[PDB]
């Protein structure tokens, strides 16, 4: 079982002041552990997760200091980005940051992430080597030269290779029962008539963790990954996920179609069929 | 470099005091420190641009600080207490950033007094070198003596023929209490200037010892018999002698 | 997280040209940056040397302190220590998530090597009016310590090092004085353990 930590931060400009809203969300694989909000009073929902409050007040005060530092840095970033695209104070914009680490079964780093985005589009991204950057536009080039002179990559590599890996392995040990767990899906196939000549076969998956699963419909053992109506992995209000896959079938040819289910929480991949 | 004002300040118990600081141009993060007279620096408040990052160590009852326009900062102490007598340091970092070092200012020496009438300026004297030393070593030691000053807010320097001298000079690192029994006891400081006998033996050479005292200000209230013990310079002079 | 720095206890006293070693150990998780700061008498703190990445050298004005990840130490070293190095030293620790933390502070005191000692106590007369005079104990070896007198009316300063640079001459000096009038050079340093060969000239 491989593991990964990822932080999702947003900076929101307003037409009154290009700062008001700042959100920082921490995730281990698919479960949330930390949430920082500027609009939250004062903040009361701090600490948040149960296995995070085991750490002393020195842990929380540090992460509150990090957020406060980041919010003032984001305010400066929101001003600088406006000048690059020649935007006005009347406009409300969104800056997004996505940083984290990827570890294997042992606990060693594989991929280091530090990605940025302005108004939904990719801005600047840290390369796999952790020494070079990737600019996604003309204005992103001027941030790259600003950052390579400031040697930002050196410190970013140091956080990902060190602090990130160190904390993720500690986070795993503190609550193995809540993170290392792998729940299998409650699978069943349903039939829908719709037409006299056509019919719909839907493959279901419920109460699984993590969200990362594979559902594929196939007739005569050959993959039908074209006529498949695959719906996005939707979550449930109890740390579980749901996902379904449908396929258009001619009448009488129901038994030709078979579905394959692949998940970490499964011992052997399921090969479902329409039974009644 | 980081600028700090004042260098020295005298305030009474329960009175208010303000400390100003300006970081190195461009430095986004500022730090306010307290260095208790005879130990390491302890953080009070930290700023990133205009906003406060940490203030958990800052006692809200008396202490307060503002960096309203993200450049210069002002640390203020409301009803001050006797324990607050320390050197108030201030540092800054470019972005800070663990790899980036902090740059410190010269600090602000604060002395909280029970009574403001205990303040006294120093009396300066220059002791001419001994003729026995001249004959015995072929060197001449001039001695300076700052007397009866309170508190240790004294800065001594040496001046020869208009120019400041640093070669062959040593001033006492710590002053001497004229009565170890008294708490608000008067201080005494000394300094040595050793020159070659040859230089002292020329009567054309003028040697002056300059002691800069840091006392009270114009805003401070004074209602006593003797002259106001303000920030002043007290000097002593000595010219060379052939015999 | 971590996060603590421990610096060497008490005041370090050495002789000039001697080897210096100031010990520092840290507890930090990940890749931290290490610093040495120096505080000369009167002036504030100033950066001496730094080592950010693992196995970084970091050296300034004869000083050396190598960052060794394997042993978790940052010892300050100098081959030929100078009198000018007498100051308070501070080790600093910071990692990507933790702000700079300082050690307690080790005070260094470098004593000069007096090549040709000639201890003597002289009487120095006042420039303006022969009102009072002082007693100057000078040219004594670094191992000679100056102590305060039993009499509360007698004022005595601790030993002081002056460097006559152009002549490559360093000397220790102490000062005694009292307004008691019955006070003299011969009895000024009667509390201090002074050499037998101390020169007392005819007053």
């Amino acid at each position: 079982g491989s593991h990964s930590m990822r932080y999702f931060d947003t900076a929101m400009s307003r037409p009154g002041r290009g700062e008001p809203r700042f959100i920082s969300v921490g995730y281990v694989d698919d479960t949330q552990f930390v949430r920082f909000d500027s609009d939250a009073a004062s903040p009361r929902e701090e600490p948040r997760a149960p296995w995070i409050e085991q750490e002393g007040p020195e842990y929380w005060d540090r992460n509150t200091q990090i957020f406060k530092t980041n919010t003032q840095t984001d305010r400066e970033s929101l001003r600088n980005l406006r000048g690059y695209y020649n935007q006005s104070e009347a406009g409300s914009h969104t800056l997004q940051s996505m940083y984290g680490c990827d570890v294997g079964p042992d606990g060693r780093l594989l991929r280091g992430h530090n990605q940025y985005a302005y108004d939904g589009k990719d801005y600047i991204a840290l390369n796999e080597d952790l020494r070079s950057w990737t600019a996604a536009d003309t204005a992103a080039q001027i941030t790259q030269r600003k950052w390579e002179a400031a040697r930002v990559a050196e410190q970013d590599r140091a956080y990902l290779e060190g602090t990130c890996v160190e904390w993720l392995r500690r986070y795993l040990e503190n609550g193995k029962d809540t993170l290392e767990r792998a729940d299998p899906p409650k699978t069943h196939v349903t039939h829908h008539p719709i037409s006299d000549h056509e019919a719909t076969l839907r493959c279901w998956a419920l109460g699984f963790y993590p969200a990362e699963i594979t559902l594929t419909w196939q007739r005569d053992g050959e993959d039908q990954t074209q006529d498949t109506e695959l719906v996005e992995t939707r979550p449930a209000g109890d740390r579980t996920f749901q996902k379904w896959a449908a396929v258009v079938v001619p009448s009488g040819e129901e038994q030709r179609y078979t579905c394959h289910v692949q998940h970490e929480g499964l011992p052997k991949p399921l090969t479902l069929r329409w039974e009644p | 470099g980081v600028a700090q004002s004042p260098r020295y300040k005298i305030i009474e118990k329960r009175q208010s005091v303000a400390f100003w600081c300006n970081p190195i141009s461009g430095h986004a993060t500022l730090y306010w420190y307290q260095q208790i007279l005879g130990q390491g620096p302890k953080l009070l408040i930290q700023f990133q641009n205009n906003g406060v990052v940490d203030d958990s160590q800052l006692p809200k009852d008396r202490f307060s600080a503002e960096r309203l326009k993200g450049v210069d900062s002002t640390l203020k102490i409301q009803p001050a207490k006797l324990e607050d007598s320390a050197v108030y340091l201030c540092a800054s970092s470019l972005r800070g950033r663990g790899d980036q070092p902090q740059h410190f200012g010269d600090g602000t020496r604060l002395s909280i007094l029970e009574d403001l009438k205990n303040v006294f300026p120093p009396e300066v004297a220059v002791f001419e070198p001994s003729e026995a030393e001249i004959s015995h070593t072929q060197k001449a030691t001039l001695v300076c003596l700052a007397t009866g000053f309170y508190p240790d807010h004294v800065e001594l320097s040496w001046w020869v023929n208009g120019k400041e001298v640093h070669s062959g000079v040593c001033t006492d690192p710590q002053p001497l209490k004229e009565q170890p029994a008294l708490n608000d006891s008067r201080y005494a400081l000394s300094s040595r200037l050793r020159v070659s006998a040859t230089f002292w033996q020329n009567p054309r050479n003028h040697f002056r010892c300059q002691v800069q005292f840091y006392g009270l200000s114009e805003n401070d209230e004074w209602t006593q018999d003797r002259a106001k013990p303000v920030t002043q310079i007290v000097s002593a002079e000595a010219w060379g002698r052939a015999d | 997280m971590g996060d603590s720095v421990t610096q060497m206890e008490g005041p370090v006293t050495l002789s000039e040209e001697a080897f210096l070693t100031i010990n520092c150990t840290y507890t930090a998780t990940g890749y931290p940056s290490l610093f040495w700061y120096v505080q000369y008498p009167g002036e504030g703190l100033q950066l001496l040397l730094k080592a950010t990445k693992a196995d970084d050298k970091g050296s300034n004005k004869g000083f050396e302190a190598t960052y060794r990840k394997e042993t978790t130490s940052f010892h300050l070293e100098k081959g030929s220590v100078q009198v000018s190095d007498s100051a308070v030293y501070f080790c600093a620790l910071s990692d990507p998530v933790n702000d700079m933390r300082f050690g307690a502070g080790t005070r260094l005191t470098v004593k000069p090597n007096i090549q040709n000692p000639d201890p003597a106590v002289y009487q120095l007369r006042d420039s303006k009016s022969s009102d009072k005079s002082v007693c100057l104990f000078t040219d004594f070896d670094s191992q000679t310590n100056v102590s305060q007198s039993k009499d509360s009316d007698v004022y005595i300063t601790d030993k002081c090092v002056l460097d006559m640079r152009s002549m490559d001459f360093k000397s220790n000096s102490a000062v005694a004085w009292s307004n008691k009038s019955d006070f003299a050079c011969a009895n000024a340093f009667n509390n201090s353990i002074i050499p037998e060969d101390t020169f007392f000239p005819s007053p």
Partner: peptide, 9 residues
């Protein structure tokens, strides 16, 4: 643990 983001865009 939250990453210290001090360098503005």
């Amino acid at each position: 643990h939250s990453k210290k983001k001090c360098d503005e865009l």
